[PDB]
Design a protein around this ligand. Structure first.
Ligand SMILES: CC(=O)N[C@@H]1[C@@H](O)[C@H](O[C@@H]2O[C@H](CO)[C@@H](O)[C@H](O)[C@H]2NC(C)=O)[C@@H](CO)O[C@H]1O
Length: 129
């Protein structure tokens, strides 16, 4: 799918990410443009061999079951193909769980560099919320 700026991320507040679990709603929208550039089907493999899945860019090494990751935990317990589709209705349980780990975005790579220390209200600015 192809989402516009104000139309891909108005659903995070619908999923309870608004100020969810120590991270405020404003710190969220910026990174998604930095992981898959507002596109749900952009997936990539990694030189760790663990293939990533979705605009979330999650890999089967630690987080899910793609059948090609042995010694993989899949503590998330769902098909990695379970998030690339148009509907993402449940897709947020692991984004949420991936934070209770006590690390937060410590797993997210781009935000820590591209969105960390940035002007975030600018990313969520002008839209209605
Ligand atoms: C923009 C983009 O797709 N970035 C990729 C990152 O998502 C990804 O980062 C992390 O890789 C680590 C393993 O090498 C894991 O901690 C983790 O699964 C993954 N991001 C998470 C889950 O937060 C790397 C590695 O595939 O590729 C970047 O390009």
């Amino acid at each position: 799918k192809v989402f516009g700026r104000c139309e891909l991320a108005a659903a995070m507040k619908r999923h309870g990410l608004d100020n969810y679990r120590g991270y405020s709603l404003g710190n969220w929208v910026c990174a998604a443009k930095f992981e898959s550039n507002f596109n749900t089907q952009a997936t990539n493999r990694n030189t760790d061999g663990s293939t990533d899945y979705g605009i979330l860019q999650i890999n089967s090494r630690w987080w899910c079951n793609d059948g090609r990751t042995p010694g993989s935990r899949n503590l998330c317990n769902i098909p990695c193909s379970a998030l690339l589709s148009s509907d993402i209705t449940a897709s947020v349980n692991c984004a949420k769980k991936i934070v209770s780990d006590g690390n937060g975005m410590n797993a997210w790579v781009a935000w820590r560099n591209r969105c960390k220390g940035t002007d975030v209200q600018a990313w969520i600015r002008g839209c209605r919320l």
